[PDB]
Amino acid sequence: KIIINLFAPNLPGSTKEDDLIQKSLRDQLVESIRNSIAYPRNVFFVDGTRGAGKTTFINSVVKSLNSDQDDVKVNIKCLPTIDPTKLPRHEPILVTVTARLNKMVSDKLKGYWASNDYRKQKEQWQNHLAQLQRGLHLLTDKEYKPEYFSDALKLDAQLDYSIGGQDLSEIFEELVKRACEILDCKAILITFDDIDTQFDAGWDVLESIRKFFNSRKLVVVATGDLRLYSQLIRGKQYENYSKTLLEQEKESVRLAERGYMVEHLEQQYLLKLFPVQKRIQLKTMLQLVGEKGKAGKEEIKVKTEPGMQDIDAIDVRQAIGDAVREGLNLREGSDADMYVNELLKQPVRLLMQVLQDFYTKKYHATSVPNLLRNALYGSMLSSIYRAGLNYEQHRFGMDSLCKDIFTYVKQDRDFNTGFYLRPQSESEALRNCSIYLASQVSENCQGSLSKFLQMLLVGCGSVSIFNQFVTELARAENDREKFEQLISEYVAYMSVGRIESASHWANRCCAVVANSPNDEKIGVFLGMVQLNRKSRQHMPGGYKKFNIDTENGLAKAAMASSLSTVASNNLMDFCSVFNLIGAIADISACRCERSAITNAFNKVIAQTTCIVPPWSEAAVRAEMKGTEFSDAITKVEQWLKNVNEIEIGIRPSALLIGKVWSRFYFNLNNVADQHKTRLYRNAEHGRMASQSNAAKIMRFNVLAFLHAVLVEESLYHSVSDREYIGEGLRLNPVTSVDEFEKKIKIIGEKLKADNKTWKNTHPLFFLLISCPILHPFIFPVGGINCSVKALNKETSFNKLIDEIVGDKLLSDEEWDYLTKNNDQQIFQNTITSLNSSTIVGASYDKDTPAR
Amino acid sequence: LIRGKQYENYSKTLLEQEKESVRLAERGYMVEHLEQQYLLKLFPVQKRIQLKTMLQLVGEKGKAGKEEIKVKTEPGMQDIDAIDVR
RNA sequence: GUCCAGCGUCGCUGGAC
Incomplete structure (x- = not known):
């Protein structure tokens, strides 16, 4: 039972307390030392x-042995700590030990009160030192001398040595015996x-x-x-070998027992010096207490607020959980236990410092992650x-921050899960930098929407897209020089780490992935057509070129903002x-009046041209060759009005974006392959599942994106503390809107019974689902399935989408017309061009196959 | 250095024998470990100062740099006549 | 709509009436 505070009058750095927390370890060590001198x-x-x-630990046991209360007759006298590194070279250790031993004896000799006793000991003690110096010549010599033989036969006076000769080990052995007699102790440390x-x-x-x-009076x-x-x-x-032998016998079989014999000699040498039963290891606070479900042998109590009682303080394990969970916008479970598990393996000196810094600033400040980054x-x-x-x-x-994410995953050489920032590496130098990175993503993205999309679109996506082109070009392990050079071009092409616009990152991302055609060379790629x-x-059939001028109204404003010309x-x-995500992330950061968003909206809808990446064949020949919107603008301006209220309450976490893109990537990848095989001459207008169209693939990518944010947000975003999905299984929409309607309805019921709305909790999906730009994409002219078994699922889906936004989006006249099976009206909220647009590489002349 | x-510090005789790829890479990390510990212990990280080069002082033409430098191309040239280093 | 012209290993692109 122990408690440790954070506020102290001395303002102690790192708050290590007095004699730290290893009293149980120290007392076990002290008892072993004391028991070790009980030979008689x-x-x-x-x-x-x-x-x-x-x-600090070795000094702690020193102060617990040189400050004894004279309780027991056996006693330990500790010499000052000896540092071999700072010791002046060409000086034997035995000389340094004797010099430090002299100070203790000489000072204690001066401390006597009986004059007769002092004079008797001084004469004898000074005699032993004079004996040692005569033999010290024998310790550092480069040659023998025949006149040393006379001193070898000089028998000692008033001293009895069991062995003749000099025997410098014996001289020091009898010197320390006297030093204990003067000091009245029984052992020297x-x-x-x-x-x-x-x-x-x-x-x-x-x-x-x-x-x-090597004696009985000495302990080291x-x-x-x-x-x-x-x-x-x-x-x-x-x-210790003959040099010539090491040059003659090297036939690779004689050398076999050369290495073996050295290890056998070396292994036995270490055991003789340091026995296994005399080794002590410091324990970090995790192996003392902290593992769930196990009652640790010790309990550590931490008080945070200044001046609380020693009885109401919080546990050490929970002293960090409240800091980590809300400092990183985590909730509970396997997501937040790993971070607090790794922090408890760190040394006690280091952790208590950051805990002192965080708690001290938290109480005085009454953003929380801002206090976690600065403390860390x-x-x-x-x-x-x-x-x-x-x-x-x-x-x-x-x-x-984008480079920091990218420069960290490269060192970890794990591109699949690099954007999770979970400290699973095998090096201690990187397990302490993911925590710092996870703190910065929370601080930067807390309380914004543009700042949320930009980091996901640019920083989070680059680690995944690049993994699609590393496998092809510049194989990693075969040659590091070429592999490392490819990364430098990659990070400097799309300007990762210095961005000009998230939309600009999209205009360049298309070219990077366009250079990987499949076997059939169809004009459909991952997330694009x-x-x-x-x-x-x-x-x-009715196919023709796109003819962008056909569109009108806000639908036209959704086409010009979705086209890139590589x-x-x-x-x-x-x-x-x-x-689109780039287009949304740009206009969502104007934060000004209508006049600004007259130009801000205008700049997004503009033709852009991007160059093929340098690591491609056409890099050289490409260079040689090379007011109706006022209503649409007004519709957008209302969205910015009610975003800000929801915008304040958003609080993303590091793991949230990691799971948002992982589902987004897999779902978007799984759309392309299914929709590329099934496309025929009379496959326009859809009306079934097999038939596909350019509009259908276009509408289904964004619907594959909103489903990803919806599922993960209700499960990981930190505003709520429970999952409004139930206890079933979940998949992604691949060809039907079925799975995007079943899930939203369940949230509509399981959350209405708890008296809540879609913006007090689960806010992010509300902003994305209700935006004027993305509205025409949801329900286009040719991407609507028309079947009696499945019309009701989509018909009910229209109301459900309408319910969340709370405003009508499709008139009943227009809704019926899209689902009419029959074969001059104007539409300002839905597109009419991608119904029969032409797709590159359409080499399927066969028609729709019956059955 | x-x-x-x-x-x-490694004994010279040790370095001829035991030259295997696995053995050479074993001590190669350990030396580099003592390299960083000694260097960090001597000069603390929270005190090192990196001196800015000519680029950070000026910055890009469109970007913002937190200084301003003008040069002279004439004896007794008036300071108004001085022009940016770019 | 037909033509001329251009790039790629037919596919793709440019111009005019």
């Missing part, structure tokens, strides 16, 4: 990596430090430990990394700098769904 |  190989290890707070700076500084430490610190604790300590031993074993920026700037992301403190924006620009010679070796005309 | 100094 004291080498310990403290595992750690990447500065995980090892130095020597604390070493890391060697992560100087790799080879530890070889003198290892040799000294096994040579001179050493911290470090066993990788660093193992390559030293293995390397020094190879330097000042605690994980190391990994951002190492990972090559944008470590700028300020100068932020959406354009700079290729339209003829020149009239053909023969027309089997300038290949021969001019190509396209109609794409991606241009 | 640092990475060159870290290789010196």
Whole structure:
């Protein structure tokens, strides 16, 4: 039972408290040390990596042994911590230890009160030091000398050594025995430090430990990394061979036992120095408590608000869940447990700092993700700098975010799920940067619609489209130089990371995917259809060129804003769904009066020309060759009026867009293949399921998009806390509007019983479903199925769509005419041209097959 | 400079034997790990300052750069006559 | 509508009456 606060009078950095939280670990370590000297190989290890707070722990046990209350006769006296790296080179460790040991004894010798005792010990203690210095010459010599033999036979006076000779190990052994008598203790503790700076500084430490610190009165604790300590031993074993033998016997079979013999020698060496039962590892707070369904052996309590009682504080696991869930607009479950699971594996020193920063600013501030990014920026700037992301403190924006998303997935080399930002990588340098990225997407996209579509259309989509062309060109693993160069051209072509318009990104996205024709070379691609620009010679039915001038009213304003002219070796005309999302994302950010949206609306409806990407054949020859709208404008201006109220309450999350596009990509991909096989000479006007048309494929792409946002928003968008879908299964519309009508009706009933509307909760779908631009696309002249079994499903669907928007969209005269089977009126809200437009590559002369 | 100094600590005799692709790549990461830790420990990340080049000072013709520089092409040339570096 | 002309491995595009 322990509680840790965040507000303290000293304003302590990182809020580590006093002696941290590892009291149970420390007391177990202290007892083992104390029990180890109850004899009537004291080498310990403290595992750690990447500065995980090892130095604080070793100091903590020092203050718990040099500040004892003299409770028990057995006592520990700790020398000051020795740092091999900072130690001056060409100085034996035994000399440094004795020098530091001298200060403790000499100061305690000065502290006596009995004059007779002080004079007796000083004479004897000073005698042992004079004995050691005589033998210190024997420790660092390059040659023997025959006059050292006389000193080897010099028998000790007033001292009895069981073995003759010099035996410098014995001289130090009797020196430490006296030092304990003066200090009245029973054991001496020597604390070493890391060697992560100087790799080879530890070889003198290892040799000294096994040579001179092997006795009963001495106990040594050493911290470090066993990788660093193992390559030293293995390397020094190879330097112990005859050099000539290593040049003659290298027949690859004699060498087989050369490597084996070194490892066997090295493995036994490590066990002798550091026994396995004397190794201690620090525990992160996750393995103490936090895993669901298990009662952890310890409980950690955290108080956030200033000055609460030690009884009403919140649990550590929930001290972060409330921060993460609402700081990233997550709700609960497998989506938010992963983020809080990874954060609990981090060192206790680091996490308590960011918790202190977030909670301190939260209480004083009374955007929440803005407080989560700033708190995390000042605690994980190391990994951002190492990972090559944008470590700028300020100068932020959406354009700079697109590269961050793209430059992160490339390092993770996983393009399928890169735009999920879920920390599943196997490197600790990247698992701490996804959290920072997931915080920025929440902050930037919270409370806007244009800022939501732009990041989805540009940042989120580029990781998926590029995966369709990596497999073909510049295979990754075969050659890194060409693969890395292709990415540089790709990111600089469509200007990922510095955008001029989301619509402009659509005018260039069409060309990038147009360069992958299938076997049949039909003019249909993923999310678009290729339209003829020149009239053909023969027309089997009522087919003709597009003739944009046929359309009128707002329907014409929906065609001009959906056409792109790719300038290949021969001019190509396209109609794409991606241009619509770009068109919406542009006008949705004017936020001004009518006068501004007279030009803002005008600029969206303009002919644009884009160049084939450089990584294509026609990159060189293409260069050589190369007021009725006032009513429509008025219709749009009302939409901007009631967007802003809904616009404020939107709160997207990182996982929401990841699931919006994943369903959007799969559904839109699955539309093209079904609608490309079934198209015949008399297949116009539809009226069944097999018959298809240019309008039908066009209308069905956007309907395949609104279904994607509808399903995911009610399940992941954070305004609500429950799913209004039920406990069934869900699919996507592929040829029928059935699945887009069944789901919307269920929400209409299961939500009406709870006394709520479509804008207080589940707001985003309401804005998309009700917009003047997309309205003509939903119900065109030739894309309506006409069958008695399925007319009612679409007829009921018209009212359901009308119910959500709350306004009439199709007059009964026009609605009947579209569904009339019979074969001069004017339409200003629906299109009449794509009913019989010409499709590129139509090579199916057979007609509709009966049965 | 640092990475060159870290290789010196490895015993020379160790580097002729055990030259296998798997072994060479094992120490190649470890040295680069000591490279970044030592460098980050010495100079903290939250204090390094990158000096802006001529581009960020000026910026693009249509974009906005947070400075303004004018040059001289005449002795005693009036400051009004000075023109942008572009 | 027919013609001239142009690009691609017939398909596609440009111009005029």
